[PDB]
Structure 1
Amino acid sequence: MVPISPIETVPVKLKPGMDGPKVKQWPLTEEKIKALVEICTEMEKEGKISKIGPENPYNTPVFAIWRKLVDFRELNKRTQDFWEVQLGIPHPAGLKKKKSVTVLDVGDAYFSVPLDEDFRKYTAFTIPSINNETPGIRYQYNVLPQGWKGSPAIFQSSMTKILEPFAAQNPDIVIYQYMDDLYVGSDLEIGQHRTKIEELRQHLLRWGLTTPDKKHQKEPPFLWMGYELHPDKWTVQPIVLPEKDSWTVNDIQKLVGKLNWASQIYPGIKVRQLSKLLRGTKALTEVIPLTEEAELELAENREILKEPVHGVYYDPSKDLIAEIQKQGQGQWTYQIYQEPFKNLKTGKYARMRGAHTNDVKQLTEAVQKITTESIVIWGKTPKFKLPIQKETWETWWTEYWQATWIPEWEFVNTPPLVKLWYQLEKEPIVGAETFYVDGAANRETKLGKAGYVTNKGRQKVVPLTNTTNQKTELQAIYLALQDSGLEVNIVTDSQYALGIIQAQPDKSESELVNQIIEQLIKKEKVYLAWVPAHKGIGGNEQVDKLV
């Protein structure tokens, strides 16, 4: 008998101040009892478990569904935290094309790795005997229990430790490690590849690890985590979108999820009109009708999901390119590719929740997102094609009060183009009329006034019902814009309005702000000045709107 290489155990402790689980064993039917006796008998014969004396105080409930089921929930609540490296999963668009690829799923994953002996006593459980007229049969685990908290991390770490030297000795092949599965790839000939696979499973056999003996049970195309993996290409598993005349919140959540999942390879997927209905959630039962925008949106989603689309694999020798398009209503879509018309992958970006915003900022955010994603997937930043002129970006970042940056990029002309809709003057305008504006509202009656006086003698005061100070101060500026020429100076005392306009939104949730924007767009030159209120500054007339 050739000795299998020893696998060193990982020391495990319970959370501090906690003791091993003591839980009452559930009453079982005689049938279930017999079944569990047989199963645990064969397991004891296989060395997976062992009979223990009465000494062990700890116990775990076992069930029968025959297949046994040890409910380690309490022990999991009492077991220490582990390092889980499973955050994130390999994205198909990140893989490099290989001439030959093999998938190996190790049988008896957790039952092949030994458990730290000093912890085994906490994995104790008992089988109820017939009629409970004899002491129940006591067992403890000797290997990693299925359903235990620490099994995946320990198994994976062990697997890595075993795999390291073979990988070191074989640079001409690449091995990816994922749970109970290994993925080997190479650009070698098919015979040499199969040979090296045999070598690998031999090397694994030395430590006592079993891989499929037959022609490996999985051959292309591979169905894995919602993905379809083909030799020259990748895509997603076919879409299922339920159609019902009555929709619930949970159904909307599922639909949104599936659409988002589909959007990584299918370009043009939109999910705004369906996500707007998820306000006032946490009630999973409800009936929410759809607007024409939402119905047309879902119809367009069915229009795109009509025919299959494939992404390609990654080639390090070619540049990485991301191209962005504006979709409207804070929606953005992007394609990542190397060769034209052959996308590595796709995606979308939705603007955050805010009162005001402009296109350039959203574009910047989209670039940041795509950048992070690309660093995750290919380990590099792609070159960008953006629907914005060099001059526009130049003006923006040079005059923006915040610091801002975009990596290497070039202008692609594919309308709608992102532009700066208006620009304020840095200095007062000569020959332009000077509008001193002001607004004020009564806190109680919600009645207010907004208006202006100018250097040429032009005046106006408008009375307003149901309004606030900020609203009147915005309204005043709006009035000034309405009744003035192509060039105008405007003096205000509102830090609020000045703050809003200095943020340079091209769009807002407040109709008044939007109308002010629309007024700014029609203007040639606008200088917006600010003064302190109630300082007795001439021309600034709080008394004209306080009446």
Structure 2
Amino acid sequence: PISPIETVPVKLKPGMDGPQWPLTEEKIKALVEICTEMEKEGKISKINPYNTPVFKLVDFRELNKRTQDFWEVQLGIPHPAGLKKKKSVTVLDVGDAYFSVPLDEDFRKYTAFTIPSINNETPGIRYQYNVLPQGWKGSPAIFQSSMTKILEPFRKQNPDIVIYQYMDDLCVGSDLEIGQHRTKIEELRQHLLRWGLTTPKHQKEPPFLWMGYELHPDKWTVQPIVLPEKDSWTVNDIQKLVGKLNWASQIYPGIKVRQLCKLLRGTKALTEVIPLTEEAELELAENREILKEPVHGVYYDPSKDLIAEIQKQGQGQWTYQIYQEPFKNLKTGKYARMRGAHTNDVKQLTEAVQKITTESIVIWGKTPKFKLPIQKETWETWWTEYWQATWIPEWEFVNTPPLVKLWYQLEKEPIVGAETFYVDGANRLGKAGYVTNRGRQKVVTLTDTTNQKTELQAIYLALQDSGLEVNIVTDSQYALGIIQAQPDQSESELVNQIIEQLIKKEKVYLAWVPAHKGIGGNEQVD
């Protein structure tokens, strides 16, 4: 009910001022009864120019607009795999406890609201809160902090008792034995009750509902969320389906949604009913089999270190799994990728590592040792030469293909004997071709292009019409860099083209020179 806790000072937003619908005789009666009660319990107090509309519900929407800002409540959630397996784990639902914490007397005023009278223009009944009001801005923020202090002592008192705060939740684990543990929860409840923090009549139990997760004792299982099978698929429905489908692809490696997505193409409304294709019916079905299957995981045991192994589900598609004991995974996930303007697999491999590394540091405060699909020479050959600062923490090469590697490598020096193609292309349509040293020549008129494309096609053709070894000199700094970055995938089909071709050769030397200049060869195409 009420508490003897050091209230906290609440101010209105920088230089602002504090913030009733007509009701039914029935809604009035009901609301007056509720309030006289809510009054007595020592929560509200009859009384002030302010007012918030009561619907029982109170619309602080405006109050809150006019209330200060607090320290970010932190919308970052603890993840099961970050829990340390414990002999015992009670969970207390504190929730209603905020109505137990006092409100900064001064502020209270604003909270004022009104209860309508039948005969309007007759004083309705006015009140205001004395403790954190459900619906108010600082309530959550404040109640937490309160709690945190109220534990503090106790957390020091008994160190082996591990507590977790989270909204209206208080997960308490320990390695104490049953009745031994039991009694501790008992003392905590009291400590809390010794302040006004009352706890349940309907005590929560072992298999736990971590939004999506099923938290069991010393392990966790995934509470299989089903696929609403039907034969009338609305747009909304196929989306929501892809939504849960994708959530799944993470802990269930195997889910695919290509064909289900296709169903979205051209759609003209949410309610539209899209008939599933054959491949849709199959995929969507082979996915009903995976989801049936339940997946279990372990917990963090500081005693044994962390390990992460990754793999490529497809170009720029990564699957990882973090574990302490082989086949005993702590967590797993997938990174379907962007398909950047101009990337490469090794680089991409890198960004996968980087997130993991961060993800870990949160969950464990430590980073994992890495098992990865790449030759150390490959890594080496690449990173020591790329123009960008890059790195992978401690790792080892795992040989479980497909391996990620260097689809190609431009030469460091011109190829002797190999042919030489001086290429160039170029208005707001165009042309682009080449003239080798050994006679050969081409050109092509392009309908609907831009300077870029042309240049590129130039280089493209150059590669088409050449042997397994070619020397190509060009003047597109843009083309140059792109390529010189030896990328194995891009946004540009054309670029894609070139990559194809580039891969195709046994040796390719790219050279670049400044345009418009009299640079021979360069001035011919020019």
TM-score (norm 2): 0.93
CA separation of 1:83/1:253 partners in 2, compared to 1, >3 Å: closer, same or farther?
farther
Secondary structure at 2:349 match in 1: helix
Q: CA deviation at 1:216?
A: 6.0
Query: Partner of 1:94 in structure 2?
Result: 82
- Structure 1 Cα separation of the partners of residues 281 and 491 of structure 2: 23
Q: CA deviation at 1:352?
A: 2.3
CA contact under 8 A between 1:96 and 1:315: conserved in structure 2? yes
Query: Partner of 1:57 in structure 2?
Result: 49
CA contact under 8 A between 1:268 and 1:333: conserved in structure 2? no
CA separation of 1:442/1:142 partners in 2, compared to 1, >3 Å: closer, same or farther?
closer
**Cα deviation digits, residues 31-84 of structure 1 (max 9, x gap):** 2111111111111111111111xxx11111112xxxx11111111111111123
- Structure 2 Cα separation of the partners of residues 529 and 340 of structure 1: 49
CA separation of 1:108/1:468 partners in 2, compared to 1, >3 Å: closer, same or farther?
closer
CA contact under 8 A between 2:423 and 2:525: conserved in structure 1? no
CA separation of 1:127/1:457 partners in 2, compared to 1, >3 Å: closer, same or farther?
same
- Structure 2 Cα separation of the partners of residues 19 and 322 of structure 1: 54
**Cα deviation digits, residues 179-205 of structure 1 (max 9, x gap):** 222111111111211111111112112
Q: Which moved more, 1:490-499 or 1:183-192?
A: 490-499
Secondary structure at 1:134 match in 2: coil
CA separation of 1:235/1:497 partners in 2, compared to 1, >3 Å: closer, same or farther?
same
CA separation of 1:295/1:331 partners in 2, compared to 1, >3 Å: closer, same or farther?
farther
Identity of matched residues, %? 98
**Cα deviation digits, residues 269-320 of structure 1 (max 9, x gap):** 4456666888999975656677777666544433421311111111111121
Q: CA deviation at 1:458?
A: 2.3
CA contact under 8 A between 1:12 and 1:119: conserved in structure 2? yes
CA separation of 1:427/1:287 partners in 2, compared to 1, >3 Å: closer, same or farther?
farther
CA contact under 8 A between 1:474 and 1:497: conserved in structure 2? yes
CA contact under 8 A between 2:369 and 2:395: conserved in structure 1? yes
- Structure 1 Cα separation of the partners of residues 18 and 121 of structure 2: 27
CA separation of 1:59/1:511 partners in 2, compared to 1, >3 Å: closer, same or farther?
closer
CA separation of 1:409/1:543 partners in 2, compared to 1, >3 Å: closer, same or farther?
closer
Secondary structure at 1:235 match in 2: strand
Q: Which moved more, 1:298-307 or 1:81-90?
A: 298-307
CA separation of 1:430/1:105 partners in 2, compared to 1, >3 Å: closer, same or farther?
same
- Asked if 1:202 corresponds to 2:190, the answer is yes
CA separation of 1:136/1:5 partners in 2, compared to 1, >3 Å: closer, same or farther?
closer
Q: CA deviation at 1:99?
A: 0.5
CA contact under 8 A between 1:58 and 1:121: conserved in structure 2? yes
Q: CA deviation at 1:354?
A: 2.2
**Cα deviation digits, residues 464-503 of structure 1 (max 9, x gap):** 3333332222222222222222222111122232122112
Secondary structure at 2:421 match in 1: strand
Query: Partner of 1:402 in structure 2?
Result: 388
Query: Partner of 1:501 in structure 2?
Result: 483
CA separation of 1:392/1:275 partners in 2, compared to 1, >3 Å: closer, same or farther?
farther
Q: CA deviation at 1:144?
A: 1.2
- Structure 2 Cα separation of the partners of residues 288 and 369 of structure 1: 37
- Structure 2 Cα separation of the partners of residues 291 and 407 of structure 1: 45
Q: Which moved more, 1:306-315 or 1:457-466?
A: 457-466
CA separation of 1:106/1:191 partners in 2, compared to 1, >3 Å: closer, same or farther?
same
CA separation of 1:322/1:72 partners in 2, compared to 1, >3 Å: closer, same or farther?
same
CA contact under 8 A between 1:235 and 1:265: conserved in structure 2? no
What count of residue pairs does the alignment treat as equivalent?
526
CA contact under 8 A between 1:4 and 1:206: conserved in structure 2? no
CA separation of 1:171/1:466 partners in 2, compared to 1, >3 Å: closer, same or farther?
same
- Structure 1 Cα separation of the partners of residues 453 and 233 of structure 2: 39
CA contact under 8 A between 1:438 and 1:542: conserved in structure 2? no
Q: CA deviation at 1:332?
A: 1.4
CA contact under 8 A between 1:114 and 1:144: conserved in structure 2? yes
CA contact under 8 A between 2:2 and 2:100: conserved in structure 1? no
- Structure 1 Cα separation of the partners of residues 225 and 54 of structure 2: 39
Q: Which moved more, 1:244-253 or 1:465-474?
A: 244-253
- Structure 1 Cα separation of the partners of residues 355 and 498 of structure 2: 31
- Structure 1 Cα separation of the partners of residues 474 and 205 of structure 2: 72
CA contact under 8 A between 1:438 and 1:541: conserved in structure 2? no
**Cα deviation digits, residues 192-229 of structure 1 (max 9, x gap):** 111111111121121122112xx761111122322211
Q: Which moved more, 1:268-277 or 1:186-195?
A: 268-277
Secondary structure at 2:165 match in 1: strand
**Cα deviation digits, residues 330-384 of structure 1 (max 9, x gap):** 3211111111112111111122252322211211111111111111111111111
- Structure 2 Cα separation of the partners of residues 518 and 133 of structure 1: 82
Q: CA deviation at 1:531?
A: 1.2
CA contact under 8 A between 2:46 and 2:126: conserved in structure 1? yes
Q: CA deviation at 1:517?
A: 1.7
- Structure 2 Cα separation of the partners of residues 468 and 111 of structure 1: 66
Q: Which moved more, 1:229-238 or 1:277-286?
A: 277-286
Query: Partner of 2:63 in structure 1?
Result: 75
Q: CA deviation at 1:431?
A: 2.0
CA separation of 1:474/1:294 partners in 2, compared to 1, >3 Å: closer, same or farther?
farther
Query: Partner of 1:485 in structure 2?
Result: 467
CA contact under 8 A between 2:28 and 2:117: conserved in structure 1? yes
Q: CA deviation at 1:165?
A: 0.2
CA separation of 1:372/1:257 partners in 2, compared to 1, >3 Å: closer, same or farther?
farther
CA contact under 8 A between 2:470 and 2:507: conserved in structure 1? yes
Secondary structure at 2:508 match in 1: strand
Q: CA deviation at 1:7?
A: 0.2
- Structure 2 Cα separation of the partners of residues 541 and 294 of structure 1: 56
CA separation of 1:372/1:252 partners in 2, compared to 1, >3 Å: closer, same or farther?
farther
- Structure 2 Cα separation of the partners of residues 251 and 329 of structure 1: 29
Q: CA deviation at 1:459?
A: 2.2
**Cα deviation digits, residues 84-133 of structure 1 (max 9, x gap):** 33311111111011111111123631221111111111111121223337
| Structure 2 residues without counterparts, runs of 5 or longer | none
Q: CA deviation at 1:455?
A: 2.0
CA separation of 1:475/1:295 partners in 2, compared to 1, >3 Å: closer, same or farther?
farther
Task: Select the residue among 89, 101, 109 that pairs with 1:113.
Answer: 101
Q: CA deviation at 1:252?
A: 4.8
Secondary structure at 1:450 match in 2: strand
- Asked if 1:442 corresponds to 2:440, the answer is no
- Structure 2 Cα separation of the partners of residues 282 and 148 of structure 1: 41
Query: Partner of 1:512 in structure 2?
Result: 494
CA separation of 1:281/1:91 partners in 2, compared to 1, >3 Å: closer, same or farther?
farther
Q: Which moved more, 1:256-265 or 1:74-83?
A: 256-265
Q: CA deviation at 1:174?
A: 0.6
CA contact under 8 A between 2:115 and 2:124: conserved in structure 1? yes
CA contact under 8 A between 1:59 and 1:124: conserved in structure 2? yes
CA separation of 1:157/1:410 partners in 2, compared to 1, >3 Å: closer, same or farther?
same
- Structure 1 Cα separation of the partners of residues 246 and 430 of structure 2: 47
CA separation of 1:463/1:58 partners in 2, compared to 1, >3 Å: closer, same or farther?
closer
CA contact under 8 A between 1:107 and 1:210: conserved in structure 2? no
CA separation of 1:524/1:288 partners in 2, compared to 1, >3 Å: closer, same or farther?
same
CA separation of 1:411/1:487 partners in 2, compared to 1, >3 Å: closer, same or farther?
same
CA separation of 1:335/1:276 partners in 2, compared to 1, >3 Å: closer, same or farther?
farther
Query: Partner of 1:169 in structure 2?
Result: 157
Secondary structure at 2:57 match in 1: strand
- Structure 1 Cα separation of the partners of residues 388 and 262 of structure 2: 30
CA separation of 1:13/1:281 partners in 2, compared to 1, >3 Å: closer, same or farther?
farther
| Structure 1 residues without counterparts, runs of 5 or longer | none
TM-score (norm 1): 0.89
Secondary structure at 2:461 match in 1: helix
CA separation of 1:249/1:495 partners in 2, compared to 1, >3 Å: closer, same or farther?
farther
